Amino acid sequence: KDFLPLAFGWFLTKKSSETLRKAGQVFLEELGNHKAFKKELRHFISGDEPKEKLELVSYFGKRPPGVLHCTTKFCDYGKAAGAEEYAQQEVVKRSYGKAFKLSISALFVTPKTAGAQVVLTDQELQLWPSDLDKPSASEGLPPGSRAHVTLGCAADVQPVQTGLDLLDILQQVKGEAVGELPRGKLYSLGKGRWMLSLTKKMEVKAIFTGYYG
Ligand SMILES: [Cl-]
Ligand SMILES: [Cl-]
């Protein structure tokens, strides 16, 4: 009867969102201007572009419109599998509207998405769904490993891809760094995949709640 949200998740405060967003843009700018990235364009890009500078801020030309957020369960108002089952959980109802701190441990880039890796607490892990299509468990990774904040997408890429891209990146790391940015060391995982491991983890303030289209 009562339909569900479009999605549950942690929605960053405008201030925490602005901070993480600005940091993301700096990372794209710095990465795109880095020697290691420039010498590896052929694996990142597909065909016909000459070899001058690619501006990643232009490349990831689809950014989240509202405040940045870390999605837990996409529900589509109940049209998604497991939506009703996730929403009715006691812990989700308990946590609804409450404040959390999300720890960001890294920022990554692939030819499809740019994002930030979220490291969920044991408390927050209770709010992670257990029936996602391709869960960490069917892949030999800790549950909630795909938790993330999308910063940008390529033109024909849907934002769901960001989580998939992270899972793949976290399989590779299961190699010496090729560079050093002001906030951390840069890794090149091949196939246009790049990861910046922050020397000090970013902490953003967010509210666990439900979003409606
Ligand atoms: Cl923002
Ligand atoms: Cl609270």
Numbering used by the authors: 162 to 335, 340 to 378
Question: What do the authors say?
Answer:
2′,3′-cyclic nucleotide 3′-phosphodiesterase (CNPase) comprises 4% of total myelin protein in the central nervous system (CNS), being the most abundant CNS non-compact myelin protein4. CNPase consists of an N-terminal polynucleotide kinase-like domain10, a catalytic phosphodiesterase domain11, and a membrane-anchored C-terminal tail, which contains a cysteine residue that undergoes isoprenylation. The catalytic domain enables the rapid hydrolysis of nucleoside 2′,3′-cyclic phosphates to nucleoside 2′-phosphates. The CNPase catalytic site, lying in a groove between two lobes, has pseudo two-fold symmetry and contains two apposing His-X-Thr-X (X denotes a hydrophobic residue) motifs, characteristic for 2H phosphoesterases 113537.
Tyr168 is one of the aromatic residues on the CNPcat surface that we suggested to form a binding surface for RNA34. Tyr168 interacts with the substrate ribose moiety through C-H…π hydrogen bonding. We carried out mutagenesis to study the role of the aromatic side chain of Tyr168. While the Y168A mutation decreases catalytic activity, Y168S retains it, albeit with an elevated KM compared to the wild-type enzyme. In the absence of the aromatic ring, the serine OH group appears to be enough to retain catalytic activity; this could be related to differences in water networks or overall dynamics in Y168A and Y168S. In the mutants, the missing ion-dipole interaction between the Tyr168 hydroxyl group and the His230 imidazole ring apparently causes His230 and Ala/Ser168 to reposition in the active site by ~1 Å. Additionally, loop α3-β2 moves towards the active site by the same distance. These structural features suggest that Tyr168 also has a role in fine-tuning the active site conformation with its bulkiness.
